[model samples]
Target: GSSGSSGNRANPDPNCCLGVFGLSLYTTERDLREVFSKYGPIADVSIVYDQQSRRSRGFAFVYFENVDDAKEAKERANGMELDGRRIRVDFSITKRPHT
Candidate 1:
């Protein structure tokens, strides 16, 4: 029997990244960064997009350099209005097992 272990992709650090939903389809990474930077220095902002249409999916991930900044942003940004829509912010989560 052959035994091998594939490289495991590390889950996103919960303390550093925030999941943002309810974004405007037109929202850009710059816009996200601008708003989030107020809470802390940002590492990056990734907006999900449709592969076929290449359009925004109305959500994004914001990475903060400091965990405290991510916490503050999550608290203050959730339920805040952005681009005429209320956005929700939470700690980023990757794949998880279902019960």
Candidate 2:
């Protein structure tokens, strides 16, 4: 056997994350995935909620498997109505600290 370096690590692409705003307070991850999955493979979806009330915060984050899909989703989904409410989509702010 040959010595090998560290194995490849699967890391999320920051560009593939999207911020979805103006979502309905009752929106769920399943509903979001169903809408966005048409563009591409979805890695994950998160609906932000209030910690105290446990109610939706009218926004969410979606992660796609590819950056292109994310861009397409953002372009097409922005201003689109979902659950009777229009939404705004944009690139998500990365969790990494800004320099």
Candidate 3:
């Protein structure tokens, strides 16, 4: 959803777009994509892992081709749990601090 076009380009298209975010705990990209895609056509899936351990940092990004579809995933997942763990979902410019 954070994707954008150049100023000279046409305004961003508003399609069914939402992200199945925050799935980083011991979660595999394949499984995460599989789970999130159940809600809709997932455009992209990325798992955030620790640079050192190469283990999940407890977060991920699930991008739906359409925002509405993404919204559906969010609706179905927000405050919900997966793999015996409760998870969080939200729109992002979600960021981190180094220090």
Candidate 4:
């Protein structure tokens, strides 16, 4: 056997940051916070941007303070259409510790 129930590992902590992609290039951090805050209390919202051009990278990270609200927002807000584009939301993979 390769491993014992490695596939059974729990899902990422919803209280952690969430990666949001396929966002409108014009989307702002405030806009993201406004939308996601409806689900629950938002700790932070950061929109990645190109340093040289100061333009959005079409993605952002949203931080939540509650796991329940994070789960709710992920299930409901994902694939939502915003600013004429459908967005993709997922628990951030980068938060895991490197072994």
**Which has the greatest TM-score?**
2
Q: Give the TM-score of candidate 2.
A: 0.80
Q: Count the backbone clashes (under 3 Å) in each candidate.
A: 0, 0, 9, 0
Considering TM-score, where higher is better, how would the candidates rank from best to worst?
2, 1, 4, 3
The per-prediction CA RMSD against the true structure, in angstroms, equals: 8.1, 11.0, 8.6, 5.1
lDDT string for model 1 (1-99, tens) is 444332222333446778899999878999999999999899788999999999988888898888888989999998999889999888776522133
- Computed on alpha carbons, the lDDT of every model, listed in order, comes to 0.82, 0.82, 0.62, 0.79
**What's the lDDT for residue 93 in model 1?**
61
**On a 0 to 100 scale, what is the lDDT of residue 50 in model 4?**
93
- TM-score for candidate 3, residues paired by index: 0.66
Give lDDT for model 2: 0.82
Error of 2 at 75 (Å): 0.3
The reply for model 3, stretches above 4 Å from the true place, is 1-24, 94-99
Q: Which RMSD does model 4 reach against the true structure?
A: 5.1
Q: What TM-score would you give candidate 4 relative to the actual structure?
A: 0.77
CA lDDT for candidate 1:
0.82
Please give the TM-score that candidate 1 achieves against the real structure: 0.79
Clashing pairs in 4: none
Candidate 3 residue 21 Cα shift, in angstroms, is: 5.9
Number of residue pairs clashing in candidate 3, backbone atoms closer than 3 angstroms, sequence gap of 3 or more or interchain: 9
Instruction: Sort every candidate by lDDT, greatest first.
Output: 2, 1, 4, 3
lDDT of 2 by residue, 2-55 (tens): 443222212222378888889888789999999999999998899888999999
